[PDB]
Each structure stands twice: as structure tokens, then as C-alpha cells.
Symmetry: C3
Subunit: 136 residues, 3 copies
Amino acid sequence: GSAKVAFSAIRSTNHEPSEMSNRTMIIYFDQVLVNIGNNFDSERSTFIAPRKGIYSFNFHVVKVYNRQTIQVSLMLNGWPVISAFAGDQDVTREAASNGVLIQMEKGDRAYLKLERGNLMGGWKYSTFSGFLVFPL
Amino acid sequence: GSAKVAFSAIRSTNHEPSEMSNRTMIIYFDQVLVNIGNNFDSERSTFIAPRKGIYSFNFHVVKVYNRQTIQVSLMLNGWPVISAFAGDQDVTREAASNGVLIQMEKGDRAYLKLERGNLMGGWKYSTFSGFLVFPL
Amino acid sequence: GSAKVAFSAIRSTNHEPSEMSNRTMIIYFDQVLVNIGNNFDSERSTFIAPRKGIYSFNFHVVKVYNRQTIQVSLMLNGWPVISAFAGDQDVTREAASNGVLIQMEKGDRAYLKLERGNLMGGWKYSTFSGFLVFPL
Ligand SMILES: *[C@@H]1O[C@H](CO)[C@@H](O[C@@H]2O[C@H](CO)[C@@H](O)[C@H](O)[C@H]2NC(C)=O)[C@H](O)[C@H]1NC(C)=O
Ligand SMILES: *[C@@H]1O[C@H](CO)[C@@H](O[C@@H]2O[C@H](CO)[C@@H](O)[C@H](O)[C@H]2NC(C)=O)[C@H](O)[C@H]1NC(C)=O
Ligand SMILES: *[C@@H]1O[C@H](CO)[C@@H](O[C@@H]2O[C@H](CO)[C@@H](O)[C@H](O)[C@H]2NC(C)=O)[C@H](O)[C@H]1NC(C)=O
């Protein structure tokens, strides 16, 4: 029970970044598909760990042609753990994708941040998900 | 026991799409590596959920140069949950990859569908896998 | 307890391949983020399964422009289970990414091998992780 913890969120439209998102560079997901434990904060697109354990995260951030390459980082309490990268071309939607397992303590925060480049043109089809693999 | 549910499948050759696959646009995996619970239907390349829970899925669909870009969607009972994308070039094999967690009920179906483009030239090296994270 | 098994490793610098790595073509990860059970051998960048079960693996191998395309394979006791691919360009860091579930027996070994191409220029930002989904 207290060890069933999972979330899943997607970007459902190609609408543009909000003003606050330009300031945080935190990547926003409007449609929450799964939120067992209610530990993902959808306003802030941030997972907050309810207990000590090993957590898994995956993300795929989709961009269109927009005169920019990007770097996306999964952030743990404001420090980048992993990054992914995408280029700039008009042939196809393209994704920055990566995933990892990390230890988190209670209250630890995980979210995605655009380190380099921007998502003007939208980031429809973007995904972010994660779950407690086991408590420690 | 009834909560150990996992599958894994790959495309082992670069052979071309069958006639029926042209009609469904459902992506076929010939080699099943894991099938605990026997809940993946290999003929139809479809996972059928044996019980209510949160399930994880991952896929990577590999294409060669074939004058087409692709969009691949994970389908839940015929509705696309996530998509991934790949372009068209002759430099390298390229993948449409994405993954997500979703709630499924008993009898719910998960499979992959080519929404845009085709896989003439084969989709060798393609992978699809998933598992019950926990029952609900 | 004996069913909590997880690792996570990354490549933290853009330093070049060592001589021994040129001989094995085994991809090395210097920073180990998670190692529950201590079943990942960091010197050899190899996970050694402590018991029979279904294990999940994910990897993303990041390259720079280096006049080479690559193929990366997850190896199970020296045989490639899945592969991923990346091309060669100077626009952006690019990744060969894939993931899968496999059955392993006790003592089985999982590691990543560069089947085609090389990682001159470094493979900073590369990731490799995996966990026991359940014992069998
Ligand atoms: C968020 O930031 C982008 C830039 O990253 C803003 O779009 C730019 O606006 C400037 C100044 O008006 C123009 O010169 C460019 O046309 C835009 N640049 C790009 C790269 O598109 C965008 O409007 C901002 N959105 C807000 C604050 O809501
Ligand atoms: C499946 O569909 C493809 C097209 O998506 C078929 O290949 C095409 O066949 C047409 C008509 O004969 C030709 O004009 C083209 O040479 C082919 N197109 C492409 C894009 O390759 C393919 O044969 C079909 N396979 C079946 C029904 O088994
Ligand atoms: C590991 O291998 C690469 C080649 O894969 C070595 O770099 C090459 O060295 C040769 C011979 O001296 C040169 O002709 C080229 O400049 C290099 N090739 C490439 C593709 O960069 C590298 O030094 C080796 N490193 C070792 C043994 O530590």
C-alpha cells in the first residue's frame, strides 16, 4: 500500500510556454495519466518522494523545428542527475529521452528542466513518469 | 505470484510487413523473450492485462531509410496514449522510442500501431516490453 | 530484502576510452548512483544477477561528432539481446537508447558493448540502469 507509488504525465497540446515556465525552465505536463499516492504535483510538474526508496524515472521531451537544440535534465532537489539532448530540424518531431534509478529521501523533489534551448513551437507528446521500485 | 506479470519481445529480422499488418498497422514482434503469466499474445503482438493495476510499457521501433518518417503510438483499447517519432535518412538505423505507466483493468489491451509512415525495409532491432508495477 | 536489487550508473566526463576498453569494447561508467545488493561490478561495468528472476535494463549511450556511427548492444553472457543505434553529426549530442526485460539465472552477466563504431570524443551523459522486477 504505502509502497505503491507511481505517476505518469504527458503534454497534450502544442501550446507555447507560459511566462513562469520561461523563468523556471521547468517542463510542464498538463495531462496526468497516473498518480498513485498523489505524490506528483501537477501544477509544478514535480514528483515529491513520500518515503525513502529507490525510484525509477523516464522522460521523453518532444520538440519541433524552432531554431534551437535542447538539453533536458532530470533534477533532484535542484541538481541535474541525468541529461538528454535533441537537435533542430524540420523533417520530424524529435525527442530528448533518458531514464535512471536514484535513491530519494522523503520530501526529495524530481522534475525536468530545460538546461539548453527552448520549446517554442510546443512540446506535445512529451512524457514523464516514475515509480517507487522499492522502499529502503 | 498472480502479481508477477512481464513481457519482452523483439523484431529479429529485417523482413517486410505482412499483408494483414498493412491493414492493422499493428507492429509485429516475432521473438518473445519473456512472457510471465502468458499475457502477451504473440500472434497479435498485444498485451492483455490479467488484472487491475499500474503497468509499465517501453518500446523502441527501429527503421531504415525508406522514404518515410514515422509516428508510433502505444494504443490502449484502440486509443493512443503516447507517441514516438522517427525521421528518414541513410546514415543510421533510427528509433521511435517512448515509455509510460498507465492504469489497466482486466482485459484491457496494449499494442503498438504505426500511425504515420511505414516499415518497408524491416524493423529489425525493434523492442516492446512491459510489466505489472503493482496491482490495484 | 534479497528481492531489492537495483543499479544505476553514468558517465560523468568526456574523457577518452582506456586501452582495455578498446579491447573489450565494453562501455564504462565511472559514477555509480545506485547499487542496492552490490551486484553491479563498477570496474567491469557489469551487472551480475544474484538470483533467478526477471530483470529490467535501460541504457542511453551519448556520443559527440567523431566520424563514426555506433551500434550498442546489451550483452547477456556475451550474446547481444537488444541493440540501439546512433549516427554522426555536429549539431547535437545524440544517444543510442533502448531497454528490455530478460530472464536471468544466478551468475548471469549483463553489460553494454559497442558493436559498431567508437566513442572517441567521450560518452559523457551516458546512462545504464536495471533492477530485479521480481524473482522466479
Ligand atoms: C518565452 O521566451 C521566448 C524566448 O525564449 C519568447 O519568445 C521570444 O520573444 C522575443 C522578444 O519579444 C522575440 O524577439 C522572439 O520572437 C521570441 N523568441 C523565440 C526564440 O521564439 C516567448 O514569448 C516567451 N513567452 C512568454 C514570456 O510568455
Ligand atoms: C504493404 O504496403 C506497402 C505500401 O505501404 C507495399 O509496397 C508498395 O507497393 C506498391 C503497389 O504495388 C508499390 O507502388 C510500391 O513499390 C510499394 N510502396 C512502398 C512505400 O514500398 C507492400 O508490398 C505491402 N505489402 C503487402 C500487402 O504484403
Ligand atoms: C583506442 O582506439 C582509437 C581508435 O579506435 C585510438 O585512436 C586512434 O589512433 C590511431 C593510431 O594511432 C590514429 O590513426 C587515430 O588518430 C585514432 N583514431 C580515431 C578514430 O580516433 C585511441 O588512441 C585508442 N586509445 C587507446 C589505446 O588508449
